[PDB]
C-alpha cells in the first residue's frame, strides 16, 4: 500500500502560475511521495501591493512565512466584524503576518493576504488532505471566492469561482442587487489570476497608534526569530516546536510544527518521528540527509539544498548534518503534538536502556556501552 | 476519487420490498454520489397497527419521521428494564415519536418502531457508513432479531435473522427452552418480512397519566414544528438546526441535522457548507437548486420535487429558492457542529472582507461594494 | 459547620411583592437549611399580559414551570439577532415555554418572559448560589435592565436598574440619544415593578406557520409529560430524569433535575442521593416524607404538602409516601449527572450484597435475607 | 486563616473504639493539622473472621492495606449482580484485597470489607472532606447501611443505621417484607457495633480456579511490592507513585498517592509540594523529618516513628532522612496527578538555573554552583 | 459576606520594600475590594542588571510587563535542561519577555527574571489567591528560594528562604556538598533581599543568532502592541483579548485577561461582565468610571489614573469614558473564557430585545425603541 515507498528524493515545485501580481508555485500531490504522507504543498510569492483573492480549501493548512511581511484577512462566519471606523467601512479582524509566522488556516475558513511591505512577499502552504476534516476525497483544492483563478492543484479535468456557478439572475435577487453587479461577482471577465495588483495604496481599518473568545482565536505564532527556541547550543543550532502547548487551534487540526535553524555542520541527532510525518522545506543551506525504512535501507541519502522540499516518513530513521552556511527549514508535522524519540545524545533511547543490554545487543564492552550513552551534550542539535 | 464527481440529480428511492404491514423504499448507496458524502437512506412506511421487527446496522443514523405518530423502542444492554407493570411483563423504556422529530440510533443498537396512530407512519432514515462507528465496510447491513425479512440494501450476494445462524439445539440450551420455540426465534417459517400486522392493539407498559444518567439518554429533539425554528423571518423562510448544542448523542457520533420550511419562493441564502456533507430530503414542495463545486461548475442545477433526495458536497456551493407552494425539506449532516458560511446576506462572507479588498477584487465601485454587502435583510433565509 | 443542621420543615414562601401584572414569591435563602444546599427559590406568577422585565444573576437557575404558557428571550451577547422582519424589527432567538418545562439560563445572562396563554404563568426557580460560576458570595442577587424593580432577596440594606447607576448625560452620550431617554431607560419614575402589563398585545417577530451551534444551544427540556418518564409502572408512579446525557447545558453547569408524579400512595423507594442534594418542590398531593443522618436521626418526619418546599441533603436517608391524590414534584439537583442510590428494589443495594453477609450484618435466616433482596418489583417507585 | 498554622508534630492515632471483631483508631480532624489540608484518617483493625459492616461517607478515601488479606465488597447503584451461582446467592464483584493495596471508594459508595485471612488485617483510611465531592461540611461521616455502630469521627452530638430512621412500619411495606424482618435491618437491638465476628467461615461467590465497562471498573492498584517501584536505587530506597496515569478513577477524584521505602539512613531528597499536601503515614522504621513554611522556619523539626501520622503542607519544602531500620511510609496527595519539585538531586531545581544565577544568588564560585549542580545521584532518594 | 460590599476605590500600592537593585510594591489583599474578587497584586520595578531571585507562590499568577525589556527563567520539574554550551553550563528554556507582554506563571512554579535591558523593567503581578490551584488559605505568598528577602504579602507574623530552614549539616549531605556552601544557600548573612544587583554582565546561555511538547510549553503572549488587537475603530480605542483560544496555559487555570488603550475620550460601551471579576490596572491616562451593582447604587463613580488599581466585581455593570491622553489598562479577569455582555452598541443587550418589549419596558416610542438600538456603531469603544 501507500508507503512501501522505495526510493526517496528532494525537490522544488513542479509548477508554476503566473499572476497579475505575483505566482504560485505547486508541488504534484500524487508522487508516493506527498501521498503516503497525506499532505500537499505549494509556495506563494505575492509581488509589492499584491493581494492574494480570497479563497478556502477542503484541507487545513499551515502557512509557514519564508520572508516578507504583510496582512492576513480570515473570515469566520458568524461573527461580528469588530474592525470599523468611528461615528462605511467594517470588516472581521485583521491580522499582521511576518517572516518566521506559521498560520493556521481552519479547512473551509475563507483568507485573503496582502502584501503591504516592500519585498515580495513569500510562505509555504502545507494542506493535510488526509486531514479526517477533509470529507471530499484525498485531492486537495481551492475554492475562490472572487476573481478568474487558474486551477492550482485541480489541473483542468484531473475555471471559475463559485459565485460564478449561480445562476445569475437569482444570485443578484439573493445578494438584492441589479445583475451587473453579480455579473461581476462571476468574474468571468476577469483575466488576472489569484493575486491582484492594486489601485495604489489598499486601505481599510488598520490599527497602528464581543465574541472576546471564539471569534478572536489566535491564527498564528512566530517560530522563526531565535528568541524563542526551545532547544539551543551555541555552536550547533537552535530548535523551535510549535504544537497544542504553544497554539490552541493546532489541538483541533492534529498539527504540529517545527522551525530549525543548524550552524556551521551542525548535526540534528538522528532520530525516528513517533506519531507524525515530517514534511521539511529547507529555508536556506546545505545539509546531508539519510532517511531509513523497517530494513535499514536508506530510502533517501543525498545533501537537500534551499528551496527543496522533502519528507521523512513516520517512524523512520532520521540524521542530519549541516552544511558550511547551515541548515534553516520549516517541518509540518502530521498530528497534535508530534514527537520524537532520538537515538543519540543526552535523551536518547539509548541511554534508556541499562548497561548490560546495551551489550549484550551490540556485543561491545561494558567500557564502550557507557560511551555510547554519554559520550555526548545535549540530545537533539549536537555540535561537529 | 471518491468526489470528484461530475454530474448531479435527486431522485426518489430506487427500490422498495413489500411486508405485511407496509413497505421500505432504499436508494442505491452505490451512486458516485451516495457514496461521496459515506451516507445511505430509505423510506420505511408502516401501515396502523405496523410493527417494525427489532434491528441494528453497523451505521448510526439519524431518523426524520415525515408523518404519523407511534412508538420506538431501543434497547441498551447492561441496562435495567425500568418500564414494568406492578405487584408479568417488563421492558426498557418507551419512546413516543412524531412528525418532525429526528431520532438518533448509534451503531449496533437494537430498535423496533410501531405504529400506534391513525395514518400511516412514514420516515426517512440516513444511514452515516463512513461513520468512524463502523469498522465493517462501506456497505450498510441491517442485522433482524427477528422474523425472515428481506435483505434491504445488501441485495441477495452483492435471508434470515442472527438467531437462525445457530445451531437450533445449542441456542434451546443457551436460551434454557425447548427446541420447538428456539425454532422460533430462527423463524424460517416466517413469511412476513421487517413490518408485521399485530393481533389486533399493541399493549405494553405504556404510561399516559436506576441510571436515571446513561440507560435513559435523549435519542430525540422535535426540529419540525415552527416554534423551534433557530433562524426566522416571516416572508423567507425558517431554519432549525440540530447539534450537540442541542441534543448530547449527536457528539457521540459527529453528526447533526436541519430542517427548514421556505415560503413563497424564498431564498436559502447562497453558501457552503464547512465542514460537512449535506444530504437533502425534500419533505414537500418546490425549489430550484444549484451546487458548484471548485472550478465553478454547477455540477447540479435542477427544480428538487417532493420525495427527492439530493446531495451537497462539503464545501461545494449552494444556492436555493422555494417554488409557489414553498420548499420543505430535512438535512443530515456528517459532522458533529456542522455549520455553513453564507455568501450573501447580514451575516455573510463579504460583510466580513473590508471595502476596498472587495472593490479590487471584483473591479467595482467603493460603491457597489457597499451595496454587495448591506443590501440585505438576515443572512440565511431572504425574502424575494 | 454549614449542614450539622438539626431540625427540618418543609414550607411555602416566606415573603411576596406585587407587581403591575403578577407577584413574586421568594424562600429565605438564610435558613440553615437552604444554605447548606447552596440553593435559593422564588415562585413568579405572571398575569396574563404581563412581561418579566430582562434581568440575570450571578447564579445558575433552573426553572420549572408550574403551568401556563409564554415566551422565554434570551441574550447572549456577541450574537447575532436571527429572528428579524424581512425586506424595522429584528430581535434574539425567543423561545415558547410551558408547563412541565425546565429552563436553563447561565449565571450572568439575561432574560425576559412573556404571558402569552390565558392563565396564570406560574413557575418556581431554583439558584445554586454555591456554583462555581457565582464568585461574588453566598448572597443570590437579581441586576435588572430596566424598570424600578423591588429587591426580592437583597432585601434593602441585607432601588433601581444598573442603568440607573450611570451618570444620565454619559449613558446617553454612550448610547447616542438625548438625555431625556437614558433617564428612563434609568426609570426613576417607573412605578411597576420587576412584571409588567402590556398594552394590548405584544407582537414581535414569532413564527408560526449564522451560529447555528453556540448562539441556538438548547435552554430548555420538557419533563412533566408523563409520555417522558424514564422510570414507570402503572399502579406506582412515573419518574423522569433530566441531566447532561439529555440536555447538553447541564454539562457546563453541574446541575441536574427531576420531575415525578407518583400514584395513590405509592412509594419512592427508600433511597439516598449520592453526590447531589435534593431541594423539592411539591407541585401537588401529600406525601408522608422521611430523611435521616448519619445517626439514623429523622432529621425531617412530616407530610409535605403542595406548594411547598423541602431538603435532602447529600447522602442523608429519604423515604416516601404519596396520599390519596397522589404526589407531583420538581426536584432540583446541585450536581451534574446527579444519582441516587436505593436500598429497597429491583437494583437496591441490599441486592448487591451476597447472602450470607446480609444474613451475618442483620443476624437473619439465610431465607429472610432472600426475602430483603427479591421480594419486590422495579426498585424506585414502589406500588403499596 | 486555615494554614498560617504555627506548630507540628507528627502522632498516633487519638481514639479508639472496640468492637466484636477488631476495632477502629481515628485521628481527631480538628486539629489546625488535618483541617489546613481537609483530610481526616482512622486506622482499622479486622481480627481473622471479622466483618465490617456496609458503609458510605460524603467524603471519597483511599485505603492503604498496611497488611493482610481479605475481600473488598463494593456497590455501585444501577449495576447488574455479576457474581453469584450457576443454574440462590448472587451479588455485585468482590475484590481480593491485600498489604500494599491502595483502594479507592468514591464518596456516596457503599462498601464492607471481610478479613479472609490469617492474621489481623490492617489499614489505614484517608478522607478528603474538601474534596468537591463533598457537599456536606468540613465534618466527615460514616453512613451505616447496617448494625448498631458506634460514631468514629461525629461525636455523639459534634446512634443507628439509616434503615433505623424510617417508620418500621413503612419500610417493611417498601421492602415487601414482615415489620419483624424490618426491625431487624435497623438493628436497635444489635450490641457489636461496625466490625462483625461471622458464624464459622464467611461464604459466597467466591472465584478461585453486560458492564464490562463502569460497573466493573478498577478500585485498587498495589503500590507496597518493591517490583513496582517507579524510582529507585540499591543504597537509597524505593519510590511508587499512584495517579492518573495509573489508577482511572483517581481522574475523577483529583486524589494521588505515594508509598515509598528507604533504605538504611537514605534520603528523601529536599523537595516542596508542588499542587497538593501530603498527608504521611509511617508504616515503619525511623526519620528525621523538617518542614519549612514561606518564612524558613521550620513549621515541623523531629523524628516521625511507626503508626504515627505526620503533614506536608502545600509548597512547604521537607527534608527526611531515614533511620537504621530504614522508612517505610505511605502518603496521601489532595490532588490529582500530584507532583514534587526537588531542590538537591539530578533533576533538582537548582540543576535548572544558569550556572552564574546560581553564583550571583549565592554569592559563590562559579565552581561551587557547580558543585551544588552536578554533585549528585539521582533527585528523590539519595544515598548517605 | 464577602462582595455585599459597600465602597470601592482605585489606589495605588499601600507598600513598598527597597531590594539592592529595585523594589517591589504590594496592594493590601485584605481590602473588602481585592477578597471579594480573589486577588492579589504588586508592582515589581526592576533596575538594570537586576535579577529577581527565584521563587514560587501557592497562587498562579498573570503578569502584565509595564515597560521594559528582559529574560524571565521558569522551572518546570522533571524537564530536561534542553539550553546548553556545546561540546560547563546547561539551563531549562530561558524567554525574553517585554512591554506588552503578558506571562503566565502556575501555583508551586519556580521563576526569575532579570532586566537584560536599559531601561527600568516594571511589572504589575496579579494572584488568583481563590484559584482552586491553592489549596493554603485567602493569604498569598512566595517561597523564595534564594537569599534572604523582606516579607512581600505575609507581613512578619501576619524572613529567609525555604532551604534556611533545613538542618544545614543534613542538606549539605543531601546535596552532598560541604557545610560552608549549603549555609550558603539558606542565606543568613544576605542582605539584599529579593531583586539582586549582578556582577556586570550576567550571561549565561543565551539564543541570538526532548519535551518538544509539555516542557516546552508557551508561557507569554504579548498583548500590548496596537498590530494585534482584537476590536478596533480609529477615533475610539483597541481592545485586545487573551483567553484559551489564544494562550493554552489559561485553560488550566480558568485565567483570562485583556489590554486595552482608548483614544481621546472615548467610551468603553456600558457592560457587565459576565462570569468573571475585572481588576484593572491604569497604565496611563484618566477615565471617568462608575460601576453598579444589583441595586443601581454606583458602588464606584471616581476618576481613575495612572498607577492606580481598581475593581470590577462579576455582573456589575460598568461605564468608562477616557480623559484627554486616552486610557491604557490591563485588566486580570478571575475566570477561564471570560466575557462581557455589553448594553449599548452594535452587540448590546438592547439590540437583542425585540421592538415592543423594548417599548414597553422603557415606557417609549416604537421609534425611541428603534434608537436605542441602532443608534450606534460597534459595541465595544465607542467614540464621543
Given amino acids: 500500500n501507500q508507503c512501501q515507498l522505495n526510493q526517496l528524493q528532494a525537490r522544488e515545485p513542479d509548477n508554476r502560475i503566473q499572476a497579475e501580481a505575483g505566482q504560485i508555485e505547486t508541488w504534484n500531490f500524487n508522487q508516493g511521495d506527498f501521498q503516503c504522507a497525506g499532505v500537499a504543498a505549494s509556495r506563494i510569492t505575492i509581488q509589492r501591493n499584491g493581494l492574494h483573492l480570497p479563497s478556502y480549501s477542503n484541507a487545513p493548512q499551515l502557512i509557514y512565512i519564508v520572508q516578507g511581511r504583510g496582512v492576513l484577512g480570515a473570515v469566520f462566519s458568524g461573527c461580528p466584524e469588530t474592525f470599523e471606523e468611528s461615528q462605511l467601512d467594517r470588516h472581521q479582524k485583521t491580522r499582521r503576518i511576518r517572516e518566521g509566522d506559521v498560520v493556521a488556516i481552519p479547512a ?34 481551492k475554492f475562490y471566492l472572487a476573481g478568474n483563478p487558474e486551477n492550482e492543484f485541480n489541473q483542468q ?18 445578494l438584492n442587487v441589479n445583475e451587473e453587479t453579480a455579473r461581476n461577482l462571476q468574474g468571468q471577465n476577469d483575466n488576472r489570476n489569484q493575486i491582484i495588483q492594486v489601485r495604489g495604496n489598499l486601505d481599510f ?77 529547507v529555508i536556506r543551506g546545505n545539509a546531508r540527509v539519510q532517511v531509513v525504512n523497517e530494513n535499514g535501507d536508506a530510502i533517501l541519502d543525498q545533501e537537500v539544498q534551499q528551496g527543496q522540499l522533502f519528507i521523512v ?39 534508556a536502556l541499562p548497561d548490560e543490554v546495551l551489550a549484550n545487543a551490540y556485543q561491545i564492552s561494558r567500557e564502550q556501552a557507557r560511551q555510547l550513552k554519554y559520550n555526548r551534550q545535549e540530545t537533539i542539535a549536537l555540535s561537529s
Wanted: proline share 5%.
Fill in 313 to 351: 516518513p513516520q517512524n523512520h530513521g532520521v540524521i542530519q548534518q549541516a552544511g558550511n552556511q547551515g541548515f534553516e527549514y520549516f517541518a509540518f508535522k502530521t498530528e497534535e503534538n508530534a514527537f520524537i524519540n532520538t537515538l543519540a545524545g543526552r535523551t536518547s533511547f539509548l541511554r
Fill in 108 to 141: 473551509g475558513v475563507a483568507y485573503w493576504s496582502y502584501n503591504d511591505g516592500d519585498q515580495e512577499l513569500v510562505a509555504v502552504n502545507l494542506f493535510h488532505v488526509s486531514s479526517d476534516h477533509n470529507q471530499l476525497d484525498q485531492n486537495p483544492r
Fill in 157 to 174: 479535468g484531473q475555471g471559475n469561482n463559485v459565485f460564478s456557478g449561480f445562476n445569475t439572475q437569482l444570485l443578484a435577487q439573493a
Fill in 205 to 281: 481599518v488598520q490599527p497602528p497608534r464581543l465574541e472576546e473568545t471564539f471569534c478572536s482565536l489566535r491564527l498564528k505564532e512566530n517560530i522563526g526569530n531565535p528568541e524563542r527556541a526551545d532547544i539551543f547550543s551555541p555552536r550547533a543550532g537552535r530548535i523551535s516546536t510549535l504544537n497544542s502547548h504553544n497554539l490552541p487551534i493546532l489541538r483541533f487540526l492534529r498539527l504540529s510544527a517545527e522551525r530549525g535553524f543548524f550552524y556551521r555542520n551542525g548535526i540534528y541527532s538522528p532520530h525516528w518521528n513517533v506519531n507524525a510525518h515530517s514534511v521539511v522545506y
